[PDB]
């Protein structure tokens, strides 16, 4: 359907710029038949580079010519059981820092990246910061006690947060977490959106 989506979106864009197969084909160094094939779903082999030229000549982006992420929901819902959970190691400028246990996601809300994060180190003094990431993030301390740092890593804002505490971090705001000094480990829920 990437090719099918491109077929329909290609036709539409060309129509809105008032071009006919021949008009577009010449600007691209192709034959009007080749263009017809694309609008016929035969554009599956076009390369990223060709898509760029096509987008350029059409005065728009590749995104505008490709379909949305799609629907992976069962009647508007999708669930994830506990064992289906994927795991990824979080080595911050290398030392084991977090453990990312991924929760359910969906192509209907791409920016939603929920996670159960195991905070490994318990020494605030060696907290490893972020640069800040695109997107807001809601957090909840699931277990243990967390020691959070944010803002300027050279002189950051801080907070001791026990179980049940919730937080909100605005996009691009640098942040770092560790368990409270000496408590060994902690766990929080992180929902990026």
């Amino acid at each position: 359907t990437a090719s099918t989506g491109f077929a329909e979106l290609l036709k539409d864009r060309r129509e809105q710029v008032k071009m006919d197969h021949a008009a577009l084909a010449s600007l691209l160094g192709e034959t009007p038949e080749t263009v017809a094939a694309w609008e016929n779903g035969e554009g599956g082999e076009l390369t990223l580079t060709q898509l760029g030229r096509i987008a350029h000549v059409l005065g728009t982006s590749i995104g505008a010519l490709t379909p949305p992420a799609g629907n992976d929901l069962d009647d508007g819902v999708i669930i994830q059981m506990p064992d289906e959970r994927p795991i990824l190691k979080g080595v911050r400028d290398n030392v084991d820092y977090y453990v990312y246990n991924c929760l359910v996601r969906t192509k209907r809300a791409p920016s939603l990246v929920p996670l159960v994060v195991d905070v490994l180190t318990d020494n605030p003094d060696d907290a490893k910061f972020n640069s800040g990431h695109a997107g807001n993030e809601f957090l909840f301390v699931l277990e243990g006690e967390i020691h959070m740092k944010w803002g300027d890593k050279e002189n950051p804002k801080e907070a001791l947060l026990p179980t049940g505490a919730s937080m909100f971090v605005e996009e691009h705001v640098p942040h770092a977490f560790t368990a409270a000094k000496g408590t060994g480990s902690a766990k929080l829920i992180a929902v990026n959106f």
Copy 2:
């Protein structure tokens, strides 16, 4: 600042429609001085109804004339301790159904409404549905085992979800929750966004 915001936004809108104090004032049955006062932050007493007429004559909405929600963050962050948590009773077409324990919120992301929801009843047979609400919702089973129902309440999709399970519910999708038959009670995290 609602009045200050309106002052600046009023000036801007009037400018974009090419009107001068007198032009606008006449269309409104006011004096150009009165308009000047509004653009001077003296519009604090205007009623909702007057704001509507003003918006109408300006060919736009009241929202376009009022400032954004505002910033309540401390360097891009806001936290909420466990005891600061507000509680609200959830009586579904009246019988105690849920208990809403509100988590942190922010005017920088108004649609974010996180919550620890106590699912009170444990009899799926008398699950009380929603009509579906505006907005997506991410869920996580915090404790116990949940019995979820969604879609057509007359013949719904269902799922037994143990601790750790996570779910996603698309906007307007009707849904209902109860603890698993006989398990007494359950608890989940609900993040509306």
Copy 3:
């Protein structure tokens, strides 16, 4: 109505943040009956300041509690006859609440001395232009060191949002159609 839209949006928002009439009332120096009344369309007299207070305690903006501009279209269309509409003379063309940012005009440039051009501070929204008659001397960017261009009849241009600009006829009047969107 501003009062009916506010009534439904206020109710959606309250419910959205799990607040009952009582809870909300406690935050605004009002009784739950008053709150319920607003949700019944009786909030029409609320002041801007009060609305600001209401949006605040609900953690949102006034705009989120007020209805959109509205619909002034006839089955999707709205028309304006030519009769129903010192640097410039703005002859305002058709407008609509279904697209507030659309502000089309036929502008008369009465001046023709480029060095006497007066820049605007730049404005929100993009702007398409078309030289309808005469020649135009366009200036944009920084007024102290601006880019310039001579535009003849038939010429079309686009100036991006917030980019300051100025117009005059070419040295020694001009008419153009400008469309903000």
Copy 4:
């Protein structure tokens, strides 16, 4: 470049979903080195189908992994001279990648028999119009039972997105400026 924008967006997305090169490679029948190469700008040869597969396993769309149209503006502006541009004759006016939806035209309506009007199926985007010359007979809505209007020179109109329409000169040619945005 499409390959450089894809390189950074692909990397942001992978990191955003907590995936390392190895994890992503395992999902696309590629080695982690190949993945790292794409993030080094070497994905230029990837096919549309492959891109579709990449967006899929990353739970998003191709558009989210590809750069925006780009910037063809001169300090915020772009100009078009009058020379650089059977129902209609479209004389395309200035366009720009900073606002793809903007498609201004000077349209020549060569026909003048309203009952021979041919509706379009409606198109995305709003459209402002201005009768530049002659008289126009406008039709819109359902082609089987459409609304109609006689528009004289100077008249301006707005047709909302997806509303089907048709134009011809008044019974017994016309020229107008149309702006899609």
